Amino acid sequence: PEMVRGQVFDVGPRYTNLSYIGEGAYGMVCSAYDNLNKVRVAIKKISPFEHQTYCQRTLREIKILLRFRHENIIGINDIIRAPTIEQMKDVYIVQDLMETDLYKLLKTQHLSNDHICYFLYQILRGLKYIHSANVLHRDLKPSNLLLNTTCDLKICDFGLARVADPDHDHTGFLTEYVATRWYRAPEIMLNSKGYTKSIDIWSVGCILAEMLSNRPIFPGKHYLDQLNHILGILGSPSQEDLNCIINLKARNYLLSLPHKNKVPWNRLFPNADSKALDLLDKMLTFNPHKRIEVEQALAHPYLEQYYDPSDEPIAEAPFKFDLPKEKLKELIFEETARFQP
Numbered sequence: 001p002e003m004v005r006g007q008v009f010d011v012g013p014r015y016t017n018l019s020y021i022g023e024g025a026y027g028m029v030c031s032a033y034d035n036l037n038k039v040r041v042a043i044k045k046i047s048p049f050e051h052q053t054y055c056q057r058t059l060r061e062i063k064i065l066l067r068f069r070h071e072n073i074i075g076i077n078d079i080i081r082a083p084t085i086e087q088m089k090d091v092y093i094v095q096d097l098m099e100t101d102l103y104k105l106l107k108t109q110h111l112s113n114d115h116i117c118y119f120l121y122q123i124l125r126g127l128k129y130i131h132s133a134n135v136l137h138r139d140l141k142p143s144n145l146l147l148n149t150t151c152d153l154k155i156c157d158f159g160l161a162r163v164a165d166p167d168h169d170h171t172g173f174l175t176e177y178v179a180t181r182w183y184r185a186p187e188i189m190l191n192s193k194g195y196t197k198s199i200d201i202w203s204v205g206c207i208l209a210e211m212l213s214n215r216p217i218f219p220g221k222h223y224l225d226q227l228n229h230i231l232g233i234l235g236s237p238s239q240e241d242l243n244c245i246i247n248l249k250a251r252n253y254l255l256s257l258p259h260k261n262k263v264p265w266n267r268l269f270p271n272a273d274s275k276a277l278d279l280l281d282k283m284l285t286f287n288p289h290k291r292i293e294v295e296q297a298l299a300h301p302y303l304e305q306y307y308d309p310s311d312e313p314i315a316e317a318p319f320k321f322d323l324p325k326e327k328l329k330e331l332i333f334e335e336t337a338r339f340q341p
């Protein structure tokens with residue numbers, strides 16, 4: 001097999017001329033020349049079979065991406081693995097090659113208002129499709145938003161996704177761990193398991209803020225610090241919003257804090273489009289029940305140049321609804337079979 005940086009990267013005769021890109025959540029990522037389609041592609045090596053948790057995440061990533069088909073979602077072009085379950089040790093996922101991600105872009109490039117508008121439109125268009133399938137992404141952040149040379153945007157990494165379950169969302173105080181810290185909604189720390197669509201809208205709001213200034217809006221230094229940053233900008237919650245939190249530990253924590261004032265968005269972002277800030281406020285709303293939903297966000301005046309519900313498709317087949325690693329390996333083998341030989 002071909003080797004890269006001293007490790008096996010076995011993508012067979014179809015894919016050649018490998019180049020190392022870097023390390024992602026799953027391991028090594030390379031580009032390669034697709035000798036069939038005559039174009040360069042991205043390839044991700046996954047090695048999950050020794051651990052049940054890794055197998056769970058890998059099955060989610062593959063099953064969801066194979067069912068979805070949408071312009072603003074990365075999808076999967078091919079999957080490479082051994083012909084037998086016995087010989088299968090690694091799985092390689094082949095995807096369209098992109099130029100960059102939004103994390104890298106924000107480190108060095110100022111975005112025009114037109115680019116912010118276009119990126120936000122594409123994020124929400126993809127998210128409408130995901131939510132219409134009854135699925136929560138649960139880890140939206142700039143590094144999971146990929147861009148090609150013409151600024152087409154693709155949402156990636158569904159390994160942390162779940163089927164929505166609003167009836168079973170309530171839990172206790174300081175127990176939950178959903179999403180990446182800076183993009184994590186306040187209720188995750190208070191009383192929520194992250195099983196409702198509002199979790200994703202919060203993350204998109206955080207991304208919009210970061211596009212406006214090139215800096216994360218709520219840069220918590222650790223898990224417990226994150227709520228300090230959120231409240232330092234939104235200010236103290238209203239009585240009505242507190243009344244929506246029945247859990248006493250969570251409500252009493254908030255009641256114990258000194259008063260904090262809201263910091264006006266236009267003071268944080270004096271060069272921003274006023275319509276962008278109105279939409280930002282609606283996405284970064286403390287009460288998840290009052291927070292704007294994806295279809296409302298698409299219809300906001302900020303996005304009027306792009307909005308067209310007939311060109312914002314939904315999923316044909318929503319997902320309506322303890323396995324050992326051995327059983328999960330079998331499921332991964334079966335899910336990837338369509339790409340043999």
Ligand SMILES: Nc1nc(-c2cccc(Br)c2)c2[nH]cnc2n1
Binds near residue numbers: 023025074096097156
């Ligand atoms: N250039 C590039 N990188 C990645 C990528 C994605 C995640 C991590 C790392 Br390191 C690289 C891609 N994923 C799909 N197409 C891709 N194109």
